[PDB]
Amino acid sequence: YTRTQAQHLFIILMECMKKKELITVFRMGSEGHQDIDLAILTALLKGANASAPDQLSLALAWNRVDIARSQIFIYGQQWPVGSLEQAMLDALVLDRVDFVKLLIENGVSMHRFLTISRLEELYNTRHGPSNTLYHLVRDVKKGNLPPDYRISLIDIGLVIE
Amino acid sequence: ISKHTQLSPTDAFGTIEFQGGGHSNKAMYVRVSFDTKPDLLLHLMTKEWQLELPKLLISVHGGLQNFELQPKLKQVFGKGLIKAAMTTGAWIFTGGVNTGVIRHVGDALKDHASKSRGKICTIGIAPWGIVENQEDLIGRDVVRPYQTMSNPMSKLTVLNSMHSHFILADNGTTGKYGAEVKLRRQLEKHISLQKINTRIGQGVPVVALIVEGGPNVISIVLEYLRDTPPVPVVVCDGSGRASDILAFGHKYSEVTIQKTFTYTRTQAQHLFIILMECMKKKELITVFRMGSEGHQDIDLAILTALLKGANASAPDQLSLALAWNRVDIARSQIFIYGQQWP
Numbered sequence: 001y002t003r004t005q006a007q008h009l010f011i012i013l014m015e016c017m018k019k020k021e022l023i024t025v026f027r028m029g030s031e032g033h034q035d036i037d038l039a040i041l042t043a044l045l046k047g048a049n050a051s052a053p054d055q056l057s058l059a060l061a062w063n064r065v066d067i068a069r070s071q072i073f074i075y076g077q078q079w080p081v082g083s084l085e086q087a088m089l090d091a092l093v094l095d096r097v098d099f100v101k102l103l104i105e106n107g108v109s110m111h112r113f114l115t116i117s118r119l120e121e122l123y124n125t126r127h128g129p130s131n132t133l134y135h136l137v138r139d140v141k142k143g144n145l146p147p148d149y150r151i152s153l154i155d156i157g158l159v160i161e
Numbered sequence: 162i163s164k165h166t167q168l169s170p171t172d173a174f175g176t177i178e179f180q181g182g183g184h185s186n187k188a189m190y191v192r193v194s195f196d197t198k199p200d201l202l203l204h205l206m207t208k209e210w211q212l213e214l215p216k217l218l219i220s221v222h223g224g225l226q227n228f229e230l231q232p233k234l235k236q237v238f239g240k241g242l243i244k245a246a247m248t249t250g251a252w253i254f255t256g257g258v259n260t261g262v263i264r265h266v267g268d269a270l271k272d273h274a275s276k277s278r279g280k281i282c283t284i285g286i287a288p289w290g291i292v293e294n295q296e297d298l299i300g301r302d303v304v305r306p307y308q309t310m311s312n313p314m315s316k317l318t319v320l321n322s323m324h325s326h327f328i329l330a331d332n333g334t335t336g337k338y339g340a341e342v343k344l345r346r347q348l349e350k351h352i353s354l355q356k357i358n359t360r361i362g363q364g365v366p367v368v369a370l371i372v373e374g375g376p377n378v379i380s381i382v383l384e385y386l387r388d389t390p391p392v393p394v395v396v397c398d399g400s401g402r403a404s405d406i407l408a409f410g411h412k413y414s415e416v417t418i419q420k421t422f423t424y425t426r427t428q429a430q431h432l433f434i435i436l437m438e439c440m441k442k443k444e445l446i447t448v449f450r451m452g453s454e455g456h457q458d459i460d461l462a463i464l465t466a467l468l469k470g471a472n473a474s475a476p477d478q479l480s481l482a483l484a485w486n487r488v489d490i491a492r493s494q495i496f497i498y499g500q501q502w503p
Contacts, residue, residue, distance in 0.1 A: 075227065078313050101183070107310045109181040 022047055041067050053083040060091055065098040073106050084108045089118065095128040116153065123151050133159075166333035168194075173329070175302045179322040181309040184274065190298070190327035192289060195340045199351035202328070210326060212282060216484050217251035217366055218352060219463070222381055223262030224373035224402055225338075230265060234399045234451060238372070239269025241459030246281050247273070249464070249485040254345060257285025257328075258292070259311070259321035262372045270323040285324045286348075288340040289331035293317045346384075353390065359480050366467045366481065369394040373402040376425065376432060382407065383435050386442045393445040393470030395462055403432075408448045410440050445470055464490050475500050 002008065016023070024043045026036050033039040041064065045055045052072060059068035088108050091099040104110070123133075136159045138145045173192035178185075189210055193202070206212055219242075230238075246253055256263045263285075270281060289295070293315055298305050311319050316336070320327070332340040353367045369385050371378060371394055385392045398408045406422075420431055439446070447466045449459050456462040464487065468478045475495060482491035 075229065076313070104181075105183045107181055109308060109310070111180060111306075 038067075042071060045071055052077050052079055053087065056083075056087050057090065060087065060094065060096060060099055063096065065102060068099070069102060073102070085113055088113055089121070092122060093125045093127050120150070120153060123153070123156060164333070172301060173298050175300060176304050177298065177307045177320075178304055179309055179320075180306045182322055184271065184323065186322055188322070188324055188327060190329060192298075192329045192331065195330040195332045195344050197330070197344065199344075199348045202348055203351060203355070206284075206326070212252075212326075213250065214355065214357070215250060215252040215282070215352075215365060216357065217245075217249050217467070218349065218368070219246065219251060219253050220349065220367070220369040221253060221255050221262060221266055222369060222371055222374070222378060223256075223404075224375055224378070224400075225261050227260055227264065228262075228373045228400070228402070230372075231399060234397075235265055235269075237451070238397065238459055239265065239272065241461075241463070242266070242370070243269055243273040243281070245460040245463050246283075247277070247279055248460075248487065251282070253281065253283045254349065255283060255285050255321075255324070256341075257287030257321060257324065258318045260318050263321050265372070267321045267323045274323070280325065282326070283324045284326045284328065285321065286328045286330065286341045286345045287320070288338055289329045290335040290337060290340065291317055292329070293319045295335070342381075350388075353392075357484065359484060361477055361480050363471070363473065363477055363481070364390075366471060367392050368463055368467055368470070370463070371396040371404045371407070373400040374404045374407075375402060378403050379407065379432050379435050379439065383439050386439060386445055391442075391445055391470065391472075393447065393466045395447045395449060395459075395466055398448065398450050407436070407439065407446070408450075410436055411443060411446050411448050414440060414443055461490075465494060468494055475502055 022043075024033075024039055025031065026033060026039045028034070033042065041062070045058065045067070048054065048058070050058075055072050056068060059065075059072060084103060084107060088100065088103045091103060133151075137151055137155050140159045141155060171192055171194075174190065177188050177190055179188065191205065207214065242253075245251070253266070255266055259267065266283070270283060273281075292298075293312065294307070297307060307320065309319055309322055328341075328344075330341045330344050334340070349367060352365055354364050357363060357365055369382070369392060371382065382394055385394055396404045396407050396411075398405050415437070417433070420433060421428055425431065445466075447456075447462055448454065449456060449462045451457070456465065464485070468481065468490070471477065471481070473481075478495050479491060482488075482495060
């Protein structure tokens with residue numbers, strides 16, 4: 001295939017095999033990861049060499065619940081304190097029902113998570129699909145509203161009434 | 162010290178709501194001394210908790226470390242245990258904390274509860290010194306919320322959810338085991354002698370289930386086999402612990418050069434004396450293997466071991482099968498060729 005044994009690519013080949021922690025091989029029925037789409041995504045989580053919260057954030061961004069279920073949520077992960085709470089808040093803002101269910105099943109409790117400030121933050125999000133809450137808040141509290149306005153829980157009570 | 166503690170009264174009983182899980186599960190609990198008489202415990206469990214007297218008792222002795230069972234084996238084990246505990250009105254005695262085989266029992270209960278009706282009377286007998294929150298449970302006869310979140314650096318373990326009742330026994334210490342084994346064995350002995358509703362004269366049958374284990378699992382198996390009423394046990398092979406060693410030793414009854422496993426103090430220390438005593442009393446051991454031997458269903462393996470383990474006559478076996486409401490068990494075992502009914 002090359003210029004006989006006189007010319008070889010063995011130096012670069014052995015350097016690559018020295019850095020073989022990142023190589024992923026996809027074989028039909030021989031090794032694991034029989035799905036190539038799983039082979040690509042699982043290589044990205046370990047290839048980033050980041051913590052569990054960063055892997056969970058990446059899986060949340062990709063909207064792949066099974067990837068986080070089979071890889072991120074395993075035995076002995078040692079989440080930092082206050083990380084699952086932030087993951088739950090991010091999943092709640094981005095409208096990820098499957099991740100909310102998975103985080104609920106894996107330890108987090110809604111009674112301690114929900115505070116007044118967190119609910120205020122939830123009511124003033126920009127992610128997710130469109131909604132008509134701003135028009136209702138404008139219609140309730142007088143004819144005029146400032147542009148850069150934070151919607152307080154009093155306004156939500158007024159619009160509910 | 163030489164057990165110089167204060168004999169204070171009990172101050173923790175009621176019901177706990179396991180906050181955090183996706184299941185709304187209630188669990189009654191009491192905190193009693195480890196020297197409490199079995200009769201009073203049975204009175205509490207029968208009259209205060211409104212539990213009917215069981216037709217069967219199952220002990221789930223296993224390893225303490227968080228081992229992992231391979232797939233296609235833990236699933237069938239969980240399904241068989243659930244079916245045996247649900248079709249037959251029975252109690253399950255577990256460790257209680259969320260470590261070892263108790264986690265497997267917990268997820269088996271959790272998977273069943275999402276598909277079928279009914280409740281399983283799972284009872285956990287755990288020491289008080291290992292719970293992650295000794296506080297948050299002192300409220301007497303009042304619902305106390307409990308958190309299932311696990312902190313790996315807390316050096317303790319959380320109470321396993323999906324358990325119907327808890328018996329928290331304390332010897333006064335904190336952070337060590339050994340305060341519940343004797344009480345659990347005494348309660349099993351006292352409930353075994355309890356009379357079933359049938360007027361034949363037979364007590365509640367008791368079986369033991371072994372998954373994973375350790376050096377003390379051989380000791381408790383030997384103690385079960387040496388009881389004045391013998392108690393059958395059931396073991397598994399795909400665990401990788403002394404249960405697998407026991408299953409291997411079940412074959413070739415009376416290979417002594419295979420006593421090296423880097424698991425105990427070399428060849429100088431061995432459990433071969435107790436192992437060979439258990440293999441001398443191997444008529445009660447039952448081994449469940451996937452596709453190798455017979456009894457491919459573990460729920461059938463448990464029930465068939467109880468009929469032969471009682472060493473009773475055909476009428477008593479038929480009465481037991483009638484009480485368990487298992488027609489197939491009597492059809493395939495009791496009604497065979499040459500039974501000689503009185």
